[PDB]
């Protein structure tokens, strides 16, 4: 499984040093992936902070409710695979679609890029770069019952729930609440 | 007490939208203060998200140890305060003296470099949403806290800071993450 990465060094040169979330221009991010993105074996990428794995991270909203899942997580993330597209930008956009459709049955109406998530507080977060989207649509079901439980919570309740969340979910909760 | 503030619209225009910490150039920031900074009554800024109160926020390191303080009482990392109108003739001048004053009111230290690291902008609390943090690392000799009946302190090794960051909140937690990544 070869997956999409960028050199952390190139990421830092292009977007600067930040911890948490930062809004960026989507065109600029896609241009960045085409210029600096490459593919590596997941087994070598997982432990090597030389690179950051590019992770589309989609928060699903159905009306005024946001989907949260437990194995709580606010976003649905996955890797971008070499086979997902001819170029890093194409692979990214197709992985975004595939990634979400693996976990849930949803009819998306619009997907909005919000920005990037970069955090350094765990071994795993240090080897990941998140591309945060808000996916507005109709939620039908989760694809695998033995993998995930789900809840659809109102934004009024997200304030409460984000206290029991960690990492990217916590950051994404803060961003979503501030946006609305 | 009239204190240094900026309009949120001016802040977002200059620095954009972020949640957490972002590195910025110190000169650019000070220029930003001179261009957009002004002073307003403190009590009347607490209830207003139209403006952000500029808070110098200094993490102190003595050798390879970092200062943690504690007045539920969380451990905290960083000493902050408001910049007062009487600290200087301009926003930049008031900031720089207020930065020094702010720290000296809380602790007895002798600091080499104040290294400006960047800005903290978090929206997770009422106080957070009206505060803009200017994060510095001050390296020096730490002697004591000014008010020993208001705070306890500990100097912890940097390899212990990850543990403490796990139980801290707010700007302390963010600042711990920034410092650990710098090292």
Tab-separated table of C-alpha atoms in Angstrom:
chain	number	residue	atom	x	y	z
A	1	UNK	CA	0.000	0.000	0.000
A	2	UNK	CA	1.785	3.111	-1.286
A	3	UNK	CA	0.212	6.270	0.097
A	4	UNK	CA	0.491	10.011	-0.446
A	5	UNK	CA	3.094	11.917	1.565
A	6	UNK	CA	4.981	15.214	1.539
A	7	UNK	CA	8.323	16.057	3.130
A	8	UNK	CA	7.629	17.800	6.433
A	9	UNK	CA	10.355	20.223	5.389
A	10	UNK	CA	8.413	21.179	2.212
A	11	UNK	CA	5.145	21.457	4.150
A	12	UNK	CA	6.813	23.856	6.605
A	13	UNK	CA	8.439	25.940	3.804
A	14	UNK	CA	5.084	26.380	2.056
A	15	UNK	CA	2.624	26.827	4.948
A	16	UNK	CA	4.791	27.830	7.900
A	17	UNK	CA	4.864	26.501	11.421
A	18	UNK	CA	1.527	26.015	13.168
A	19	UNK	CA	-0.042	23.811	15.782
A	20	UNK	CA	-3.773	23.164	15.414
A	21	UNK	CA	-5.809	24.385	12.414
A	22	UNK	CA	-5.155	27.004	9.769
A	23	UNK	CA	-7.328	28.085	6.887
A	24	UNK	CA	-5.503	27.911	3.558
A	25	UNK	CA	-6.585	28.380	-0.034
A	26	UNK	CA	-7.693	25.033	-1.530
A	27	UNK	CA	-6.137	25.733	-4.948
A	28	UNK	CA	-2.824	26.494	-3.146
A	29	UNK	CA	-3.026	23.207	-1.250
A	30	UNK	CA	-3.755	21.158	-4.378
A	31	UNK	CA	-0.877	22.928	-6.198
A	32	UNK	CA	1.346	22.047	-3.221
A	33	UNK	CA	0.427	18.358	-3.476
A	34	UNK	CA	1.222	18.280	-7.199
A	35	UNK	CA	4.559	19.989	-6.663
A	36	UNK	CA	5.734	18.189	-3.515
A	37	UNK	CA	3.573	15.082	-3.086
A	38	UNK	CA	4.907	11.595	-3.620
A	39	UNK	CA	4.040	8.012	-2.702
A	40	UNK	CA	5.678	5.740	-0.094
A	41	UNK	CA	5.004	2.397	1.483
A	42	UNK	CA	2.687	2.858	4.455
A	43	UNK	CA	4.924	0.591	6.604
A	44	UNK	CA	7.897	2.953	6.155
A	45	UNK	CA	5.816	6.178	6.346
A	46	UNK	CA	4.071	5.217	9.620
A	47	UNK	CA	7.177	5.768	11.796
A	48	UNK	CA	9.139	8.363	9.835
A	49	UNK	CA	8.618	12.014	10.741
A	50	UNK	CA	10.652	13.001	7.645
A	51	UNK	CA	7.279	12.824	5.864
A	52	UNK	CA	3.685	13.637	6.646
A	53	UNK	CA	0.944	11.390	5.293
A	54	UNK	CA	-1.825	13.400	3.628
A	55	UNK	CA	-5.178	12.610	5.267
A	56	UNK	CA	-8.503	13.938	3.953
A	57	UNK	CA	-10.574	14.390	7.115
A	58	UNK	CA	-14.286	14.901	6.545
A	59	UNK	CA	-16.843	16.066	9.105
A	60	UNK	CA	-20.362	14.998	8.023
A	61	UNK	CA	-23.288	17.323	8.791
A	62	UNK	CA	-26.895	16.348	8.119
A	63	UNK	CA	-29.023	19.459	8.664
A	64	UNK	CA	-27.972	20.980	11.992
A	65	UNK	CA	-26.510	17.692	13.298
A	66	UNK	CA	-22.915	16.426	13.041
A	67	UNK	CA	-21.981	12.770	12.783
A	68	UNK	CA	-19.715	11.399	15.504
A	69	UNK	CA	-18.528	7.777	15.653
A	70	UNK	CA	-16.941	5.437	18.204
A	71	UNK	CA	-14.921	2.227	17.729
A	72	UNK	CA	-15.631	9.638	19.869
A	73	UNK	CA	-14.357	10.853	16.513
A	74	UNK	CA	-15.725	13.885	14.663
A	75	UNK	CA	-14.018	13.390	11.286
A	76	UNK	CA	-13.752	10.522	8.888
A	77	UNK	CA	-10.137	10.186	7.688
A	78	UNK	CA	-8.111	7.863	5.516
A	79	UNK	CA	-4.986	7.625	3.392
A	80	UNK	CA	-4.665	8.564	-0.271
A	81	UNK	CA	-3.436	5.605	-2.350
A	82	UNK	CA	-1.137	5.638	-5.361
A	83	UNK	CA	-3.887	3.971	-7.425
A	84	UNK	CA	-6.446	6.677	-6.580
A	85	UNK	CA	-5.361	8.957	-9.431
A	86	UNK	CA	-2.758	9.862	-12.022
A	87	UNK	CA	-1.400	12.859	-10.103
A	88	UNK	CA	-1.221	13.702	-6.408
A	89	UNK	CA	-4.069	16.211	-6.703
A	90	UNK	CA	-6.320	13.702	-8.557
A	91	UNK	CA	-5.419	10.892	-6.163
A	92	UNK	CA	-6.227	13.161	-3.221
A	93	UNK	CA	-9.701	14.164	-4.481
A	94	UNK	CA	-10.627	10.523	-5.317
A	95	UNK	CA	-9.246	9.244	-1.993
A	96	UNK	CA	-11.388	11.873	-0.283
A	97	UNK	CA	-14.472	10.381	-1.966
A	98	UNK	CA	-13.458	6.727	-1.396
A	99	UNK	CA	-12.340	7.256	2.172
A	100	UNK	CA	-15.754	8.508	3.296
A	101	UNK	CA	-17.725	5.954	1.244
A	102	UNK	CA	-15.823	3.110	2.923
A	103	UNK	CA	-17.072	4.083	6.388
A	104	UNK	CA	-20.566	5.525	5.848
A	105	UNK	CA	-23.523	5.612	3.489
A	106	UNK	CA	-24.179	9.297	2.824
A	107	UNK	CA	-25.567	11.399	0.006
A	108	UNK	CA	-23.324	14.464	0.007
A	109	UNK	CA	-24.706	17.711	-1.320
A	110	UNK	CA	-21.538	19.765	-0.923
A	111	UNK	CA	-18.006	19.248	0.341
A	112	UNK	CA	-16.256	22.381	1.559
A	113	UNK	CA	-12.510	22.493	2.217
A	114	UNK	CA	-11.881	24.315	5.494
A	115	UNK	CA	-8.128	24.173	5.982
A	116	UNK	CA	-5.301	22.106	7.315
A	117	UNK	CA	-4.790	20.373	10.638
A	118	UNK	CA	-1.209	20.005	11.887
A	119	UNK	CA	-0.551	18.826	15.422
A	120	UNK	CA	2.500	17.385	17.077
A	121	UNK	CA	1.177	15.967	20.318
A	122	UNK	CA	1.321	12.252	19.421
A	123	UNK	CA	3.534	9.952	17.404
A	124	UNK	CA	0.656	9.457	14.960
A	125	UNK	CA	-0.254	13.136	14.630
A	126	UNK	CA	3.428	13.929	13.881
A	127	UNK	CA	3.370	11.759	10.735
A	128	UNK	CA	-0.025	13.081	9.491
A	129	UNK	CA	-1.196	16.277	7.750
A	130	UNK	CA	-4.993	16.699	7.769
A	131	UNK	CA	-7.110	18.341	5.110
A	132	UNK	CA	-10.316	19.296	6.905
A	133	UNK	CA	-13.619	19.299	4.988
A	134	UNK	CA	-17.197	19.831	5.988
A	135	UNK	CA	-19.433	17.441	4.054
A	136	UNK	CA	-23.086	18.491	4.099
A	137	UNK	CA	-25.552	15.821	3.120
A	138	UNK	CA	-27.983	13.099	4.094
A	139	UNK	CA	-26.660	10.373	6.436
A	140	UNK	CA	-28.192	6.919	5.914
A	141	UNK	CA	-26.019	4.410	7.776
A	142	UNK	CA	-22.569	3.195	8.758
A	143	UNK	CA	-21.156	0.528	6.405
A	144	UNK	CA	-19.762	-1.875	9.043
A	145	UNK	CA	-21.665	-2.349	12.345
A	146	UNK	CA	-18.809	-4.355	13.974
A	147	UNK	CA	-16.436	-1.431	13.337
A	148	UNK	CA	-18.336	1.760	14.338
A	149	UNK	CA	-21.208	3.056	16.486
A	150	UNK	CA	-22.615	6.469	15.468
A	151	UNK	CA	-24.502	9.472	16.823
A	152	UNK	CA	-25.930	12.566	15.096
A	153	UNK	CA	-25.600	15.435	17.561
A	154	UNK	CA	-26.748	19.049	17.382
A	155	UNK	CA	-24.063	21.762	17.319
A	156	UNK	CA	-25.406	23.005	20.686
A	157	UNK	CA	-24.331	19.571	22.061
A	158	UNK	CA	-20.949	19.524	20.314
A	159	UNK	CA	-19.601	22.004	22.879
A	160	UNK	CA	-20.345	19.311	25.504
A	161	UNK	CA	-19.010	16.334	23.497
A	162	UNK	CA	-15.733	18.022	22.481
A	163	UNK	CA	-14.658	17.715	26.143
A	164	UNK	CA	-14.474	13.904	25.737
A	165	UNK	CA	-12.616	14.143	22.400
A	166	UNK	CA	-8.876	14.230	21.681
A	167	UNK	CA	-6.510	15.215	18.873
A	168	UNK	CA	-7.960	16.159	15.514
A	169	UNK	CA	-11.546	15.687	16.711
A	170	UNK	CA	-11.068	18.315	19.412
A	171	UNK	CA	-9.448	20.739	16.969
A	172	UNK	CA	-12.183	20.133	14.368
A	173	UNK	CA	-14.907	20.660	17.001
A	174	UNK	CA	-13.373	24.030	17.933
A	175	UNK	CA	-13.196	25.054	14.273
A	176	UNK	CA	-16.772	23.980	13.461
A	177	UNK	CA	-18.228	25.710	16.535
A	178	UNK	CA	-16.365	28.938	15.756
A	179	UNK	CA	-17.504	28.772	12.107
A	180	UNK	CA	-21.225	28.571	13.012
B	1	UNK	CA	-6.775	50.245	33.637
B	2	UNK	CA	-6.933	50.946	29.880
B	3	UNK	CA	-5.330	48.052	27.987
B	4	UNK	CA	-3.941	47.200	24.529
B	5	UNK	CA	-6.413	45.723	22.053
B	6	UNK	CA	-6.829	45.170	18.318
B	7	UNK	CA	-10.004	44.826	16.254
B	8	UNK	CA	-10.656	41.188	15.407
B	9	UNK	CA	-11.305	42.194	11.775
B	10	UNK	CA	-7.818	43.802	11.598
B	11	UNK	CA	-6.236	40.695	13.226
B	12	UNK	CA	-7.924	38.242	10.841
B	13	UNK	CA	-7.077	40.456	7.856
B	14	UNK	CA	-3.399	40.549	8.833
B	15	UNK	CA	-2.961	36.979	10.083
B	16	UNK	CA	-5.865	34.960	8.728
B	17	UNK	CA	-7.935	32.272	10.374
B	18	UNK	CA	-6.245	29.775	12.671
B	19	UNK	CA	-7.051	27.836	15.834
B	20	UNK	CA	-4.104	27.130	18.112
B	21	UNK	CA	-0.638	28.542	17.488
B	22	UNK	CA	0.987	30.059	14.391
B	23	UNK	CA	4.600	31.212	13.955
B	24	UNK	CA	4.908	34.828	12.847
B	25	UNK	CA	7.791	37.267	12.433
B	26	UNK	CA	8.277	39.472	15.489
B	27	UNK	CA	8.896	42.660	13.514
B	28	UNK	CA	5.700	42.044	11.475
B	29	UNK	CA	3.760	41.630	14.730
B	30	UNK	CA	5.144	44.807	16.350
B	31	UNK	CA	4.389	46.731	13.136
B	32	UNK	CA	0.879	45.245	13.274
B	33	UNK	CA	0.501	46.608	16.815
B	34	UNK	CA	1.695	50.093	15.848
B	35	UNK	CA	-0.652	50.099	12.846
B	36	UNK	CA	-3.790	48.600	14.459
B	37	UNK	CA	-3.275	48.659	18.235
B	38	UNK	CA	-5.219	50.970	20.540
B	39	UNK	CA	-6.168	51.107	24.235
B	40	UNK	CA	-9.555	50.537	25.898
B	41	UNK	CA	-11.022	49.949	29.367
B	42	UNK	CA	-10.451	46.330	30.476
B	43	UNK	CA	-13.947	45.700	31.866
B	44	UNK	CA	-15.455	46.808	28.535
B	45	UNK	CA	-13.205	44.487	26.463
B	46	UNK	CA	-14.127	41.339	28.478
B	47	UNK	CA	-17.648	41.393	26.923
B	48	UNK	CA	-16.592	42.104	23.319
B	49	UNK	CA	-15.525	39.674	20.571
B	50	UNK	CA	-15.170	42.657	18.188
B	51	UNK	CA	-11.720	43.114	19.744
B	52	UNK	CA	-8.907	40.956	21.072
B	53	UNK	CA	-6.825	41.886	24.107
B	54	UNK	CA	-3.103	41.534	23.371
B	55	UNK	CA	-1.565	39.282	26.030
B	56	UNK	CA	2.201	38.843	26.208
B	57	UNK	CA	2.647	35.219	27.350
B	58	UNK	CA	6.077	34.075	28.472
B	59	UNK	CA	7.303	30.559	29.077
B	60	UNK	CA	10.420	30.595	31.255
B	61	UNK	CA	13.296	28.126	30.933
B	62	UNK	CA	16.191	27.887	33.424
B	63	UNK	CA	18.837	25.759	31.738
B	64	UNK	CA	17.114	22.679	30.354
B	65	UNK	CA	14.148	23.039	32.723
B	66	UNK	CA	10.848	24.833	32.199
B	67	UNK	CA	8.824	26.706	34.818
B	68	UNK	CA	5.435	25.214	35.740
B	69	UNK	CA	3.213	27.070	38.197
B	70	UNK	CA	0.077	26.172	40.111
B	71	UNK	CA	-2.189	28.331	42.278
B	72	UNK	CA	-9.354	22.738	40.947
B	73	UNK	CA	-5.860	24.001	40.262
B	74	UNK	CA	-4.287	22.969	36.987
B	75	UNK	CA	-0.598	23.187	36.300
B	76	UNK	CA	0.087	26.168	34.040
B	77	UNK	CA	2.844	27.000	31.568
B	78	UNK	CA	3.290	30.631	30.669
B	79	UNK	CA	2.993	33.931	32.495
B	80	UNK	CA	0.682	36.431	30.843
B	81	UNK	CA	-0.848	39.815	31.468
B	82	UNK	CA	-2.436	42.811	29.782
B	83	UNK	CA	-0.502	45.683	28.235
B	84	UNK	CA	-1.493	48.941	29.958
B	85	UNK	CA	-1.785	52.366	28.321
B	86	UNK	CA	0.799	53.737	30.770
B	87	UNK	CA	3.424	51.188	29.709
B	88	UNK	CA	4.390	53.282	26.676
B	89	UNK	CA	3.754	56.134	24.237
B	90	UNK	CA	2.863	53.763	21.365
B	91	UNK	CA	1.400	50.207	21.122
B	92	UNK	CA	4.845	48.772	20.320
B	93	UNK	CA	6.583	50.610	23.154
B	94	UNK	CA	3.771	49.768	25.609
B	95	UNK	CA	3.887	46.120	24.501
B	96	UNK	CA	7.629	45.766	25.014
B	97	UNK	CA	7.654	47.393	28.482
B	98	UNK	CA	4.371	45.706	29.480
B	99	UNK	CA	5.886	42.357	28.452
B	100	UNK	CA	8.789	42.975	30.877
B	101	UNK	CA	6.524	44.386	33.628
B	102	UNK	CA	3.965	41.566	33.288
B	103	UNK	CA	6.682	38.954	33.922
B	104	UNK	CA	8.413	40.899	36.744
B	105	UNK	CA	5.135	41.276	38.698
B	106	UNK	CA	4.833	37.476	38.902
B	107	UNK	CA	8.372	36.141	39.145
B	108	UNK	CA	11.936	37.048	40.052
B	109	UNK	CA	14.004	35.989	37.046
B	110	UNK	CA	16.994	37.195	35.066
B	111	UNK	CA	16.285	36.530	31.371
B	112	UNK	CA	18.775	36.458	28.459
B	113	UNK	CA	16.681	36.224	25.302
B	114	UNK	CA	13.027	36.717	25.011
B	115	UNK	CA	12.575	34.734	21.831
B	116	UNK	CA	9.262	35.554	20.182
B	117	UNK	CA	7.673	32.310	18.935
B	118	UNK	CA	4.330	33.448	17.520
B	119	UNK	CA	0.635	33.928	18.206
B	120	UNK	CA	-1.965	31.952	20.132
B	121	UNK	CA	-5.567	32.260	19.017
B	122	UNK	CA	-8.009	29.768	20.476
B	123	UNK	CA	-11.755	29.913	20.652
B	124	UNK	CA	-12.542	27.183	23.199
B	125	UNK	CA	-13.544	29.526	26.095
B	126	UNK	CA	-15.143	32.920	26.715
B	127	UNK	CA	-11.795	34.332	27.822
B	128	UNK	CA	-9.903	32.673	24.938
B	129	UNK	CA	-12.109	34.238	22.262
B	130	UNK	CA	-11.288	37.791	23.449
B	131	UNK	CA	-7.532	37.188	23.997
B	132	UNK	CA	-4.674	37.133	21.493
B	133	UNK	CA	-1.517	35.586	22.941
B	134	UNK	CA	1.977	36.644	21.938
B	135	UNK	CA	4.076	33.634	22.887
B	136	UNK	CA	7.692	34.025	23.986
B	137	UNK	CA	10.329	31.703	25.330
B	138	UNK	CA	12.411	33.486	27.984
B	139	UNK	CA	15.645	31.727	28.899
B	140	UNK	CA	17.437	32.766	32.091
B	141	UNK	CA	17.863	32.241	35.799
B	142	UNK	CA	14.682	31.705	37.793
B	143	UNK	CA	14.855	32.646	41.488
B	144	UNK	CA	11.294	32.634	42.826
B	145	UNK	CA	7.663	33.659	42.429
B	146	UNK	CA	6.841	37.158	43.704
B	147	UNK	CA	3.728	35.939	45.520
B	148	UNK	CA	4.543	32.644	47.238
B	149	UNK	CA	1.081	32.700	48.846
B	150	UNK	CA	-0.518	32.891	45.364
B	151	UNK	CA	1.519	30.283	43.411
B	152	UNK	CA	3.706	27.261	43.748
B	153	UNK	CA	6.299	26.546	41.098
B	154	UNK	CA	8.355	23.661	39.791
B	155	UNK	CA	11.191	23.555	37.291
B	156	UNK	CA	10.686	20.399	35.242
B	157	UNK	CA	12.983	18.732	32.749
B	158	UNK	CA	11.823	19.094	29.148
B	159	UNK	CA	11.486	15.279	28.881
B	160	UNK	CA	8.838	15.563	31.636
B	161	UNK	CA	6.894	18.315	29.873
B	162	UNK	CA	4.885	15.878	27.695
B	163	UNK	CA	3.428	14.329	30.900
B	164	UNK	CA	2.408	17.759	32.237
B	165	UNK	CA	0.943	18.842	28.893
B	166	UNK	CA	-1.415	15.888	29.200
B	167	UNK	CA	-3.117	17.446	32.266
B	168	UNK	CA	-2.936	21.097	31.282
B	169	UNK	CA	-5.555	23.073	29.354
B	170	UNK	CA	-5.952	26.204	27.234
B	171	UNK	CA	-2.884	28.245	26.312
B	172	UNK	CA	-0.735	26.148	28.672
B	173	UNK	CA	-1.483	22.988	26.692
B	174	UNK	CA	-0.923	24.741	23.358
B	175	UNK	CA	2.323	26.306	24.528
B	176	UNK	CA	3.635	22.938	25.797
B	177	UNK	CA	3.020	21.430	22.359
B	178	UNK	CA	4.871	24.354	20.681
B	179	UNK	CA	7.838	24.085	23.032
B	180	UNK	CA	8.151	20.308	22.710
B	181	UNK	CA	8.111	20.624	18.900
B	182	UNK	CA	10.722	23.409	18.975
B	183	UNK	CA	12.919	20.904	20.830
